[PDB]
Amino acid sequence: ENILYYCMNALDVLYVFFKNKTKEWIMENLPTIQNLLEKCIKSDHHDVQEALQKVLQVIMKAIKAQGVSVIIEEESPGKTFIQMLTSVITQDLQETSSVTAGVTLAWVLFMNFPDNIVPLLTPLMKTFSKLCKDHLSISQPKDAMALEEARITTKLLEKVLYILSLKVSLLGDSRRPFLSTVALLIDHSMDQNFLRKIVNMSRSWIFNTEIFPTVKEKAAILTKMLAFEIRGEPSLSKLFYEIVLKLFDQE
């Protein structure tokens, strides 16, 4: 039972810390929950994906902390705790159950702050480089029941590490694997709904009044959109011709 306790208590700590200090004074009381849950923040290493799947809530509420910037210092060891362990656990290779925490924790950190792990983010990009090379490990497997968890949750963190990396544009000197992986996606099997968000996110790329320092990167990913016709799947293409239409309206 010893993990189901932490799911059910994670829900219980969710409501108990909704309304203990409704005005959000968990500001120097967070060392106690840090020294209550710090053995459980790095859970999904040792066990199933379900653990931080349930810790997502109290993490989502804990990062709601109201100014742990340069101003008051208390969870700045806590932040440099958790972004350190995503530093470690995204290094942890060779299984699907060794990297599931690193997308999640830094993803919730990114979901609340304009900061990210921008000074340290690049190995999760390598995790994307890890998970892009699992296209062959989802194409030659032709059916489920070989760990449906490792089917749809692996597509789920494929979604998460499309979204948290491909949104931000302050990426450094690694944009050409960043976009050659996206073309490497659109080459392969790649069912529609987790590509509707990357053509929606291609729409996020194209209309950048922000610099995005050359147009020919948009050209390089955007040439691969013509593969959508030869796929045999027509329904995603109308989005592309819509943004070509709107892309020709403003000139």
Side-chain angles (χ1 to χ4, degrees):
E1 195 184 3
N2 50 4
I3 299 170
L4 280 78
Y5 288 104
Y6 292 105
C7 296
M8 296 296 172
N9 75 22
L11 302 170
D12 200 359
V13 170
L14 163 130
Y15 186 71
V16 165
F17 289 158
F18 265 117
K19 298 284 101 176
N20 284 324
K21 279 80 69 175
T22 65
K23 63 101 174 177
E24 197 181 3
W25 184 64
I26 313 169
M27 300 178 75
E28 66 268 20
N29 300 110
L30 61 86
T32 309
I33 189 174
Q34 180 64 254
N35 294 117
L36 184 274
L37 207 278
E38 86 283 24
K39 67 180 183 180
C40 299
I41 297 174
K42 55 182 73 66
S43 295
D44 284 338
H45 183 275
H46 73 279
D47 60 352
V48 295
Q49 195 268 333
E50 190 71 28
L52 281 67
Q53 187 71 257
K54 299 298 289 294
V55 187
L56 275 162
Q57 294 174 354
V58 67
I59 293 174
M60 179 67 202
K61 297 169 67 181
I63 300 176
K64 181 65 178 294
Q66 199 265 328
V68 194
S69 297
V70 179
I71 51 98
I72 63 167
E73 196 265 333
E74 189 66 33
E75 206 176 1
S76 61
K79 288 182 181 180
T80 60
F81 178 72
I82 50 174
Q83 75 183 359
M84 186 62 205
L85 72 94
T86 61
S87 304
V88 175
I89 198 64
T90 54
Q91 292 299 110
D92 196 358
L93 73 161
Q94 86 186 358
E95 285 188 356
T96 180
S97 177
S98 68
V99 78
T100 54
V103 296
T104 299
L105 189 36
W107 181 55
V108 180
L109 179 61
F110 174 66
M111 280 175 66
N112 202 3
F113 290 155
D115 197 1
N116 198 359
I117 55 169
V118 174
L120 290 83
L121 83 165
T122 61
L124 68 39
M125 178 179 171
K126 182 66 179 68
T127 300
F128 185 61
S129 299
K130 182 177 180 180
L131 291 173
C132 290
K133 300 297 286 186
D134 289 332
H135 293 174
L136 56 90
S137 179
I138 58 96
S139 65
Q140 282 75 241
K142 64 183 181 293
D143 196 359
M145 188 267 174
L147 294 173
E148 296 96 354
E149 183 177 359
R151 295 291 187 271
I152 62 171
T153 67
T154 53
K155 272 88 169 65
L156 196 157
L157 76 146
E158 275 190 358
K159 291 178 184 288
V160 175
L161 100 178
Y162 304 139
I163 291 159
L164 95 162
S165 175
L166 284 47
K167 278 182 178 180
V168 69
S169 175
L170 210 273
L171 189 146
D173 53 353
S174 63
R175 63 180 64 186
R176 59 99 61 220
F178 173 75
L179 296 176
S180 73
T181 46
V182 175
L184 200 43
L185 265 55
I186 302 163
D187 290 331
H188 296 88
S189 178
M190 293 294 106
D191 292 331
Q192 297 87 15
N193 55 1
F194 60 97
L195 268 64
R196 192 260 180 272
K197 292 179 287 296
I198 73 171
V199 302
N200 196 4
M201 201 164 291
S202 298
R203 184 187 296 112
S204 306
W205 293 348
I206 291 163
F207 287 172
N208 285 321
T209 57
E210 196 266 332
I211 294 96
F212 192 78
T214 178
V215 188
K216 196 173 287 294
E217 297 296 328
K218 298 176 185 179
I221 52 95
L222 205 44
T223 48
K224 195 63 70 176
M225 300 293 109
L226 295 175
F228 288 155
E229 300 294 327
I230 206 166
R231 292 295 298 164
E233 191 272 333
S235 177
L236 294 173
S237 299
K238 188 261 181 183
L239 290 81
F240 169 65
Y241 298 110
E242 183 66 31
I243 53 175
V244 171
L245 175 67
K246 187 65 70 177
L247 194 273
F248 290 166
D249 294 336
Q250 57 176 358
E251 183 176 0

